[PDB]
Design a protein around this ligand. Sequence first.
Ligand SMILES: *[C@@H]1O[C@H](CO)[C@@H](O[C@@H]2O[C@H](CO)[C@@H](O)[C@H](O)[C@H]2NC(C)=O)[C@H](O)[C@H]1NC(C)=O
Ligand SMILES: *[C@@H]1O[C@H](CO)[C@@H](O[C@@H]2O[C@H](CO)[C@@H](O)[C@H](O)[C@H]2NC(C)=O)[C@H](O)[C@H]1NC(C)=O
Ligand SMILES: *[C@@H]1O[C@H](CO)[C@@H](O[C@@H]2O[C@H](CO)[C@@H](O)[C@H](O)[C@H]2NC(C)=O)[C@H](O)[C@H]1NC(C)=O
Ligand code: NAG
Ligand code: MAN
Ligand code: MAN
Length: 542
Amino acid sequence: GTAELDALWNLVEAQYPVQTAAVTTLVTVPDDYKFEADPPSYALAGYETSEIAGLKFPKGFKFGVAGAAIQVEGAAKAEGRGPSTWDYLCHHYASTQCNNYDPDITTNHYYLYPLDFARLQHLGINTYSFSISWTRIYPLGAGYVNEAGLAHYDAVIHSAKKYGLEPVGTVFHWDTPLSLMLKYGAWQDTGDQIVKDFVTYATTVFKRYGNEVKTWFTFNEPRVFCSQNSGLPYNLTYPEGINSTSAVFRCTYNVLKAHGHAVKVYRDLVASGTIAAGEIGFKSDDNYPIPARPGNADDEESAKRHEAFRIGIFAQPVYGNGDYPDVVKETVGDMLPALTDEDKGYIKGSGDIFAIDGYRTDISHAALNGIANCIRNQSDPNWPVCEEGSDPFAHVYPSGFAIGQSADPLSSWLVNSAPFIRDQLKFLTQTYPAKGGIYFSEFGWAEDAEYDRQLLYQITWDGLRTQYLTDYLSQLLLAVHKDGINLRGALTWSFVDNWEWGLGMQQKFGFQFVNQSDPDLTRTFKLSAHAYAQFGRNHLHH
Ligand SMILES: *[C@@H]1O[C@H](CO)[C@@H](O[C@@H]2O[C@H](CO)[C@@H](O)[C@H](O)[C@H]2NC(C)=O)[C@H](O)[C@H]1NC(C)=O
Ligand SMILES: *[C@@H]1O[C@H](CO)[C@@H](O[C@@H]2O[C@H](CO)[C@@H](O)[C@H](O)[C@H]2NC(C)=O)[C@H](O)[C@H]1NC(C)=O
Ligand SMILES: *[C@@H]1O[C@H](CO)[C@@H](O[C@@H]2O[C@H](CO)[C@@H](O)[C@H](O)[C@H]2NC(C)=O)[C@H](O)[C@H]1NC(C)=O
Ligand SMILES: *[C@@H]1O[C@H](CO)[C@@H](O)[C@H](O)[C@H]1NC(C)=O
Ligand SMILES: *[C@H]1O[C@H](CO)[C@@H](O)[C@H](O)[C@@H]1O
Ligand SMILES: *[C@H]1O[C@H](CO)[C@@H](O)[C@H](O)[C@@H]1O
């Protein structure tokens, strides 16, 4: 075995070791598997608006679910895997950064996936979005490849297709290799080793899986990911010249570069016949907020600044003019490395598809102390967007009423803003056009205080999640037929209650309940799973 790997896990486990699940064997699905009974017929009867009666998504529409490796897999040390920055974080600062959880086991999907896939087939799901753990493939981020890790996802993809699930792959979903962070600061790299290391990793998984995975995302929510680089454990290892503010924009640049170069490799692999042709982009998130006071020039300005910093900083280089938005360049200056002409040749046009994690739409109130004042004060709490960023503004009209229903208060960024979906899709497809169209690549609900229920029947009738998914799907269906949006699919986050980063298993996003007090981590369908299934039955082509 490799010695540097052992040293890294010794480091990670210095205060407490990785916990091992009760099941560490690939489960097999018996042909006599009995699914729990359906909910009462009145639970969803006549539940959809009449406005969508008889409307169908286009043929081939990806009607599916989304997960991510470190959030659902567990098996943190199984079969050669090296540690990620989150393994380190939670094993060292669990009580302050991870809500006293860690991703050691989560839902144990690493071993339970055939059972998960059989349950998804029962619901008529036709698409399975997953991410690949970089450190299962290159346990040190770079150097030797872990064949056991490559073979694992071979079996996952094969099992998915056997159960009717088209696999959609994300190369990087926030699980930075700890080794690369320690060696040179990972995404804060002031050189370009992080790009070389990411591209080598991406090349390996494209070669191994590109004949069976034909829809790829390089990065999941790169704007959200790079803002995490301002905290632990990344700010233990900043290179000289980097602080927690400039770390975010050095990360932005390195990710844009890594994305462009990986897309270049992917296209080379397709053009050489090495792998089947597919489509590649990255997953955007956030939104173009509505101004708090329509027609007010300040709210309108802060709304666009929000869009520029939360979407445009990655989407304009890839799908637009090939450079950062001007309002970004003017505010952050030289903390953001400039895109050279050579850089732009890789990045511009490197997205066949757009994908939006369209959870919600916000409201933009211009900074009460003036946008012009805010912009110039890097220490202003609303810098650099210079809208009022706190919850009592971001979700609230001047009237004092919210834009919509709030979800669990620990995920206060999340609200049901279904009436605004069609406007977001129109803005995104006109501003960041992609030949392959647009995916609604994540959307989901954290039902308020669902973690405090003690009785299963109280959990499984999850009315506000059911409403949210049905509302959103209905608006997506209307975006296709009324607005002509080239919508390629809808993927809900998520199919199981899983490990939600710093909140751990407390926050429940699944349309299935995962019983974390049971050695088998038994899954149970919630009502929302059946609402999702029924919407697929009523509105997909068969
Ligand atoms: C590094 O990141 C951590 C977050 O993981 C930052 O923690 C903040 O620390 C300040 C100082 O005590 C507290 O006011 C904040 O509440 C902390 N935030 C969190 C989320 O714990 C830390 O500031 C960063 N260190 C820097 C910038 O040097
Ligand atoms: C982190 O680094 C940035 C620069 O990389 C610092 O911003 C500089 O701040 C000085 C002092 O006002 C200015 O002269 C420069 O104009 C700033 N650079 C910019 C904004 O482009 C930033 O202050 C550092 N942050 C902290 C808190 O250490
Ligand atoms: C830049 O923003 C910082 C943070 O808001 C401002 O610092 C505050 O100054 C106000 C003045 O009344 C005090 O009430 C706060 O105690 C200060 N807080 C901190 C953390 O410094 C600073 O005034 C702003 N500078 C400007 C407007 O140029
Ligand atoms: C979860 O499973 C445990 C152990 O079997 C059982 O104690 C508990 O009732 C279950 N909780 C549910 C279904 O909410
Ligand atoms: C859980 O426990 C096993 C021992 O059975 C270890 O191999 C693993 O690393 C984890 O500590
Ligand atoms: C999964 O791995 C664990 C590690 O301790 C074993 O105990 C178990 O028998 C299975 O092989």
